[PDB]
């Protein structure tokens, strides 16, 4: 009687995810699961939201890999950190 | 009082999904949530499983994206099919 269902948490958010963000296999795994949009390299300027400087994206919205975390716990997004 | 923990159905399923595969955003997202190793095209000859022919790789496991449903279903690998 468990749900068969991934919630969309994460829907709309555009992400690039660095190699070198720790925990980046379970962050990836996860981020996906929950309906978020990882883009590659060579398509970082699309993003909405960064990990790590805003020099690159100005307009993106700065988080963490624990900004992920605490959206996944809550069922939806949190205010960004 | 809901888990937060996404099940490892797939794990050590290494998979290429073509992007021509019918249904292919949905189905990546599911296979990768649930523990599944996507594969890109260059990396297709050390693939467990194949969609489609085996022609390029014998030894893989011939399955279907019914298949992936049916073991997300189950909660767990079912017979390939």
């Known amino acids: 009687s468990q749900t068969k ?3 969309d948490i994460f829907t709309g958010v ?3 995810l660095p190699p070198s963000t720790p925990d980046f296999s379970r ?6 699961a929950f309906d978020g ?3 590659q390299e060579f398509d970082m300027t ?3 939201h960064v990990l790590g400087s805003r020099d690159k ?3 993106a919205q700065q988080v963490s890999p624990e900004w ?7 069922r939806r997004l949190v205010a960004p950190s």
């Not at 992920?68 to 809550?74: G, V």
Request: proline content about 4%.
């Open 37 to 39: 949009d990882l883009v």
């Open 14 to 16: 555009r992400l690039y």
């Open 46 to 48: 699309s993003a909405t």
């Open 27 to 32: 962050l990836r795994r996860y981020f996906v």
């Open 57 to 59: 994206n100005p307009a």
């Open 68 to 74: 992920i975390w605490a959206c996944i716990r809550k």
């Open 5 to 7: 269902v991934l919630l």
